[PDB]
């Protein structure tokens, strides 16, 4: 499974599987627009409960 | 040496999930499509 | 397994630096072309390395002008002898 | 779609969703027109209609759609071609039945 | 696979001479010697390491050539160059490019007058180099 | 954010850019990552984006809907956009928006290329369409309000085609050329 | 992902201890620790995870306590809250409120001062 | 007129949210009163935040009961020792 | 897997694509390395493979066995598919799978040329056979179920030859031509 | 005949903890300790030790979730499993499967982030 896991990490992440593939993305404002929007929303409404969002890749999408 | 290195080509693939180095990172297909060696590993 | 991640990232950083240098050199070449400087890629790269190597900008400019005059004189001599 | 997938697989160039949408815009428009035409010709046909009646309604819909797309002009050229091919194919069984009746004198 | 490293002035000058003259170093020995002699005693403490002056000079030259659009393009290129942290002596690079720049108008085939102005630049000599 | 901005300009409203049926496309809220002057400039561009969105809505209204087979096709042109002239008008509008779509895609690609580009670069690049689109939107709204039908629509377009804006003049020339092509097809059938 | 600047669970637990005890947070440290322990303790699943079932249970409990008017008011408030759609966890809040409902007729069993004896 | 659409909509949304929070707190207070829950506006807001964060109502009720018993015991002890 | 998939379509079931006597060739289970939409595509391909496997089973059942010289050839026709028409039917089925085999070989060559190819290319390339095979399989299953015997099977094929699928029509024409060649040989002997 | 090295239940449990957490066994040490504590604890007998009774309970539970088609499918799968005869402890596996069933209709009472405090 170790070689298979290494391939699975390198053959494109299981995000297409219901298993959450966390992928590294740039925190730049233009690149972290989802994260920046999450930060602004988190900052703006004290009644705002953050919904669970699945991060998907643009290529995957 | 800088000029020999200058003659290096790099991938035009960019993404809007990456901004600090948009030189591509090879999405690397998966579901069959990674080829015979990956299929053998899967088997 | 730990150690391999650093060398790969370093290599990627070096490649990105090379691509950035290439892009910068392309921009410089375009600037020269708009300015009609007449420098080629190899000559431009050599000049870039020389300036990066610490050549005095007044000295570098004078040397470049003298070298260009010498190259033009040599090309004129080659065309006159041909 | 396969050509787009191949270009994605090569991964050499940044392909964005907007780029794909723009590439598919003519095909997407053709799909929308086809969807509307199909809905009118088939989906709008009541289920209990006789197969003859369903066919006749479809044929009349095809004729009217043909008129509409011919009036739509050059912008429908791909759609007009699609409709003309569709008409030829749909008449093929009908034209075959007509041919059999004319040649053999027997309506099969 | 070349990593940038400081190479002796002789190697750079040899390669430069070879590419400029398009001949072997043996065929440019006299020119190489003359250039070496001039270059070997030339340090610029008087040059002000200020990109802004070079950019302004480039803009003025482009305007003189009726190339305001090209001046804007050059400004954008300079902005991109500043965005990249590849070059450290940008003032030197800009000065070299401007000095080696040849006017396409000199578009046309000549340039109207050369009434060089006192405008110029700084002398930096004020510092104890 | 630039990708989101282009998506809003591409007709996908988001959390930053809200679409209002009455107001059109609008910035939904103040974002913490924008200076209020930057927010003001972005909304100023969003005015053009709203006009584009309204144009796209009109395009859907006049080309995206099936022509009702009302027995009298001449009256179909009045209430609903219908008629060969209506199809030509919608086609011309889509053709004129195609260059805008192309410019938007090129802008998206360029912004993807350089992370140091700002919205001011887009505002510069898109200003030509920020001037072009309002006049065509006014013309389309006038066409809708006057219920121009058949070739009488062509006459109105001709009157509007005589505008003074060279880019608007060229666009109206393209539209008029398409309408004249349709007219010439009908004339060919008649002759 | 709209995460309201929710002061950390520790601050909320400390504030709750201070509020309940009528002592400052520093004076409710043992009570704050107790609250943290209770929240950290594994609890059986709540009796009702259905907003409407919790509202109905609250109404039934009020009726059993002969608070029929209070039962109707609870049912009406629950209907209004469900239509309002303001609460994100209606089932949890409704279950909590039902569990916290008190019969005014049943004399509150005053926690004997004696509990303090074992703290030393 | 163009620039105003973001901030004006943001302000209207904030005002609507404030009015909605006030209405929700009033509804919750009425429900608590009918149920004789004893919660105040500040306590109601804290409880709402806790429920929004996912606390188990059975766990929350058990924790609340234990905290209330400890608070009552501490107040009784302070009154008995004074 | 693509080679494994073709082998399953070539009649070699594996761990992913299991052959069931009742269900035919089927994908054994959902695998974690495929998107559920990819799982659906795989299941469609396994449906095609199942149809191919069932066709191969029928081919073996009526052609794969040496003809037993049971003295009464007429009674062979009842229980087991038998008869010169039955042999012709099996031969036609094998000939129709021959073009399918050729297409599968071309797919194999393409996959050998490019290891990065995905299932979508195969699904595009194989869709014609994904449409062809179900209809021929239905026709064969109908022939088997109705116990069409002798030249009366030919009449059913003619009825089936009246199908609307041009490729199915052509395939049934080829099979009918082979059976008619045998029929004509018998008729020649009689005449 | 060297029956594939089915690592002893302790090693299997460690691998399971690592797999469930998506961390290496070394990174799941606190979770491994919790698992070891649970496994060493005396567990009550399963509610049903009859394969058919457990299967019937599973079918009834699926019907209770308004999954009548799923209840029929469960009964059919149970019949198929009983006929297959591969499992030695049908009652235990059936009880486990029943215990692991989740109602899709019951809105998940989102486990407050506070539960993570005790995981360490």
| DSSP class per residue in B1-43 | -HHHHHT----B---TT--S--S---------TT-HHHHHHH-
**CA-nearest residue of chain F to E79?**
F116
Q: How many CB atoms lie within 10 A of CB C2?
A: 5
Residues of J in contact with G16 (CB under 8 A): none
Is J113 near chain G, with CB under 8 Å?
A: yes
F140 inside 8 A of chain A by CB: no
Give the C:E interface size as CB pairs under 8 Å. Answer: 153
Distance of CA H52 to the CA centre of its chain: 10
Q: Work out the burial of residue J47: count CB atoms within 10 Å of its CB; fewer than 13 is exposed, 13-18 middle, 19 or more buried.
A: exposed
Please tell me if residue E20 touches chain C, with a CB cutoff of 8 Å.
yes
Are H9 and F46 inside 8 Å of each other by CB?
Answer: no
Distance, in Å, from the CA atom of G92 to the CA atom of F52, rounded to the nearest integer, reads 46
Chain A residues near residue I34 by CB distance under 8 angstroms: 16
C16/B2 touch (CB, cutoff 8 Å), yes or no: no
Q: What is the resolution of this structure in A?
A: 6.8
Of H2, H7, H10, the CB nearest to F44: H2
Asked if D18 lies within 8 A of F6 by C-beta distance, the reply is yes
Instruction: Identify the residue whose tokens are 């009472």.
Output: J109
How wide is the angle at C-alpha J75 spanned by C-alphas J71 and J80, nearest 5°? Answer: 145
Q: Nearest Cβ partner of A12 from B16, B30, B41?
A: B30
Taking the C-alpha atoms of residue F42 and residue H6, their distance in angstroms, rounded to an integer, is: 9
Please judge whether C46 and B6 are an interchain contact, meaning their C-beta atoms are less than 8 angstroms apart: no
Q: Judge contact between I168 and I130, C-beta under 8 A.
A: no
Cβ–Cβ under 8 Å, residues H47 and G93: yes
Cβ-Cβ contacts under 8 Å, B14 against chain F: 112-113
DSSP category for residue E86: S
G45 touches chain J (CB under 8 A): yes
Answer yes or no: do F43 and H2 touch at CB < 8 A.
Answer: yes
Print the SS3 string covering chain I.
CHHHHHHHHCCCCCCCEEEECCCEEEECCCCCCCCHHHHHHHHHHHHHHHHHHHHHHHHHHHHCCCCCCCCCHHHHHHHCCCCHHHHHHHHHHHHHHHHHHHHHHHHHHHHHHCCCCCHHHHHHHCHHHHHHHHHHHHHHHHHHHHCCCCHHHHHHHHHHHCCCCHHHHHHHHHHHHHHHHHHHHHHHHHC
Cα C28 to Cα F161: distance, rounded to the nearest angstrom: 46
Contact F84 D73 (CB under 8 A): yes
Straight-line distance from the first to the last Cα atom of chain C, in angstroms, rounded to the nearest whole number: 64
Query: I170 at the D interface (CB within 8 A)?
Result: no
- Number of A/G CB contacts below 8 angstroms equals 34
Q: Could you count the other beta carbons within 10 Å of the beta carbon of residue A16?
A: 21
Contacts of F114 in chain E (CB under 8 A): 80, 83
A17 phi/psi in degrees, rounded to 5: -90, 150
CB C46 within 8 A of CB B37: no
Cα separation of I187 and C22, whole Å? 83
Give CA–CA dist E110/E116, Å, rounded. Answer: 16
Cβ neighbour number for residue I56 with a 10 Å cutoff:
18
Q: Which residues 6+ apart lie within 8 Å of G97 measured at CB?
A: G54, G58, H31, H32, H35, H37
Q: How far apart are CA G92 and CA G99, in angstroms?
A: 10
Chain E, window 33-92: residues with a beta carbon less than 8 angstroms from a chain C beta carbon: 34-35, 38-39, 42-44, 46-47, 49, 58, 61-62, 67, 70, 73-74, 77, 80-81, 84, 86-89, 91-92
Closest residue by Cα to residue D21 from J33, J53, A61: A61
| Locus of tokens 């069993």 | G109
Question: E14 and C67 in contact (C-beta within 8 Å)?
Answer: no
CB I119 within 8 A of CB B31: yes
Residues of chain A neighbouring H21 (CB-CB closer than 8 A): 47
Partners of A44 on chain G (C-beta within 8 Å) are: 2
Among F42, F41, F2, F31, which Cα is nearest to A36's? Answer: F31
Portion 61-100 of G in contact with A at CB < 8 A: 88
* Residues 6 or more apart in contact with residue E23 via CB below 8 angstroms: C74
Cβ neighbours of residue A19 closer than 8 Å, sequence gap 6 or more: I32
Question: If you search the block for the tokens 């006929």, which residue do you land on?
Answer: J83
Nearest of I147, I141, I136, I151 to residue I85 by alpha carbon? I151
Round to whole Å and give the CA distance between I99 and I171. 10
Burial of residue G13 (number of CB atoms within 10 Å: 0-12, 13-18, 19+): buried
Q: Name the neighbours of D, counting chains with at least 3 Cβ pairs within 8 A.
A: A, B, F, I
CA distance D58 to chain A (A): 38
Q: How far away is chain G from the Cα of J118, in angstroms, using its nearest Cα?
A: 6
> Does I115 contact chain B (CB < 8 Å)?
yes
- Probe site for chain J from G8, G9, G52, G82 (most J CB atoms < 10 A): G9
B10 in contact with chain C, both atoms CB, cutoff 8 A: yes
d(C-alpha A40, C-alpha A48), whole Å: 11
Spatial separation of the C-alpha atoms in residues F181 and I83, rounded to whole Å? 68
Give contacts of A40 with chain F, Cβ < 8 Å.
31-33
Q: What distance in Å separates residue A31's CA from the closest CA in chain I? A: 26
CA J35 to chain centre: 14
| CB-CB contact of D5 with F92 (8 Å) | no
Three-state DSSP at A20 gives coil
CB contacts, 8 Å: G39 with chain J: 112, 114
CA pair distance C54, E43, nearest whole angstrom: 10
What whole-number distance in Å separates Cα of residue I145 and Cα of residue I172? 18
Residues of B in contact with C45 (CB under 8 A): 2-3, 6
Judging contacts by C-beta atoms under 8 Å, the chain D residues touching residue A11 are none
Answer whether B25 touches F (CB < 8 Å): no
With an 8 Å Cβ cutoff, is B36 touching chain I? yes
Tokens of E18: 């070879």
Distance from the Cα of E6 to chain B's closest Cα (Å) equals: 9
Cβ burial of A61 (10 Å; 0-12, 13-18, 19+) is: exposed
Could you tell me how many residues make up chain D? 108
Neighbours of chain J (3+ CB pairs under 8 A): G, H
Q: Which residues pair with I18 in a beta bridge?
A: I26
CB E17 within 8 A of CB E28: yes
If phi > 0 it is left, if psi is from -120 to 50 it is alpha, else beta; for residue G21 that is alpha
Chain H: residues touching A (Cβ < 8 Å):
17, 21, 48-49, 52-53
Q: SS3 for J72?
A: helix
Structure tokens at F36: 């209020």
Dihedral in degrees, nearest 10, Cα atoms C11, C16, C22, C27:
-170
């Amino acid at each position: 499974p170790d070689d298979r896991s290494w391939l699975e990490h390198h053959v494109v992440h299981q995000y297409w599987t219901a298993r959450p593939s966390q992928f590294p993305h740039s925190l730049h404002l233009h690149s972290n627009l989802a994260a920046v929007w999450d930060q602004h929303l988190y900052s703006s409404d004290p009644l705002y409960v953050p919904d669970d969002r699945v991060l998907v890749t643009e290529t995957q999408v | 040496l800088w000029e020999a290195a200058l003659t290096y080509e790099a991938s035009k693939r960019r993404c809007w999930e990456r901004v600090g180095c948009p030189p591509g990172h090879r999405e690397e297909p998966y579901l069959t499509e990674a080829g015979r060696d990956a299929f053998d590993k899967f088997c | 397994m730990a150690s391999s991640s650093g060398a790969g990232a370093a290599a990627a950083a070096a490649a990105a630096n090379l691509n950035a240098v290439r892009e910068t050199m392309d921009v410089l070449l375009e600037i020269s072309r708009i300015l009609n400087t007449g420098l080629d890629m190899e000559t431009l790269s050599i000049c870039v390395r020389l300036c990066e190597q610490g050549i005095n900008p007044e000295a570098l400019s004078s040397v470049i002008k003298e070298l260009r005059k010498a190259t033009e004189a040599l090309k004129a001599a080659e065309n006159m002898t041909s | 779609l396969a050509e787009i997938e191949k270009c994605i697989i090569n991964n050499d160039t940044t392909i964005t969703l907007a780029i794909v949408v723009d590439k598919l815009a003519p095909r997407l428009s053709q799909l929308k027109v086809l969807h509307k035409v199909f809905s009118t010709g088939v989906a709008e046909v009541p289920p209990d209609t006789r197969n003859v009646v369903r066919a006749s309604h479809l044929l009349n819909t095809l004729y009217k759609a043909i008129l509409e797309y011919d009036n739509v002009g050059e912008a429908s050229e791909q759609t007009v071609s699609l409709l003309f091919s569709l008409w030829v194919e749909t008449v093929r069984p009908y034209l075959q039945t007509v041919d059999e009746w004319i040649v053999h004198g027997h309506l099969w | 696979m070349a990593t940038p490293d400081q190479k002796s002035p002789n190697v750079l000058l040899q390669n430069l001479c070879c590419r400029i003259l398009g001949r072997s170093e043996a065929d440019v020995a006299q020119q190489f010697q003359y250039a070496v002699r001039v270059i070997g005693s030339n340090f610029a403490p008087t040059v002000e390491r200020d990109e802004f002056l070079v950019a302004e000079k480039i803009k003025k030259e482009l305007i003189r050539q009726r190339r305001e659009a090209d001046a804007a393009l050059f400004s954008e290129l300079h902005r991109k160059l500043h965005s990249q942290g590849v070059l450290k002596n940008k003032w030197s690079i800009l000065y070299l490019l401007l000095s080696l720049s040849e006017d396409p108008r000199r578009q046309p085939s000549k340039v109207s007058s050369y009434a060089t102005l006192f405008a110029q630049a700084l002398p930096r000599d004020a510092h104890s180099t | 954010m630039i990708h989101e901005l282009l998506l809003a300009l591409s007709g996908y409203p988001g959390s930053i850019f809200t679409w209002n049926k009455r107001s059109g496309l609008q910035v939904s809220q103040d974002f913490p990552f924008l200076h209020p002057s930057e927010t003001s400039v972005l909304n100023r561009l969003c005015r053009l984006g709203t006009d584009y969105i309204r144009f796209t809505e009109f395009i859907e209204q006049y080309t995206g809907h099936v022509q009702q087979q009302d027995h009298h096709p001449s009256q179909q042109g009045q209430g609903g956009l219908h008629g060969i002239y209506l199809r030509a008008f919608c086609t011309g509008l889509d053709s004129v928006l195609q260059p805008y779509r192309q410019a938007l895609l090129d802008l998206e690609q360029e912004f993807l290329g350089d992370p140091h580009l700002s919205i001011s670069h887009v505002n510069y690049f898109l200003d030509q369409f920020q001037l072009l689109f309002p006049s065509v939107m006014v013309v389309v709204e006038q066409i809708k309000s006057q219920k121009i039908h058949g070739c009488q629509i062509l006459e109105t377009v001709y009157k509007h085609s005589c505008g003074g804006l060279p880019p608007v003049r060229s666009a109206l020339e393209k539209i008029l050329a398409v309408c004249h092509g349709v007219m010439y097809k009908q004339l060919s059938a008649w002759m």
